[PDB]
């Protein structure tokens, strides 16, 4: 759309269908055209590549949208049926070194 990020930071939403392997992305509440289909048993790590043009770069948000499970519910086995989003201490940001 343009000019929709200066007012409020842009939000890409990543949804993964573990039952079908369909990777689709939504940005600013509208689905993007690009989609990825992965093969079964694929282990996918959330990842962000960024070159910093600011003191603050980005922010991992672990919320949920309508009709979708939070990320912790898929990451952890004990939280498989817990709609409340969670960020347990095991989860942490890693970087290539």
């Amino acid at each position: 759309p343009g000019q929709g990020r200066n007012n409020n930071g842009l939000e890409i939403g990543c949804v993964v269908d573990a039952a079908s392997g369909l990777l689709t992305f939504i940005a600013n509440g509208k689905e993007l055209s690009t989609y990825y289909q992965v093969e079964p048993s694929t282990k996918l790590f959330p990842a962000v590549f960024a070159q910093a043009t600011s003191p603050n770069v980005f922010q991992f948000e672990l919320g949920r949208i309508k009709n979708v499970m939070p990320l912790s519910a898929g990451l952890f086995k004990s939280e498989h049926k817990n709609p409340v989003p969670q960020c347990p201490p095991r989860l942490h940001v890693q970087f290539l070194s």
Binding site: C14, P46, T53, V68, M69
Partner: protein, 34 residues
């Protein structure tokens, strides 16, 4: 209101990334890696 039964039978998971205003979006990539 989200359907509680759909949330229990579903396998779709979500996370989002906020690029703070002032950071160039062309320099930021979001998605999944193996």
């Amino acid at each position: 209101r989200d359907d509680y039964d759909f949330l229990m039978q579903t396998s779709t998971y979500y996370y989002s990334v906020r690029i703070f205003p002032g950071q160039e979006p062309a320099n930021v990539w979001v998605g999944w890696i193996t």
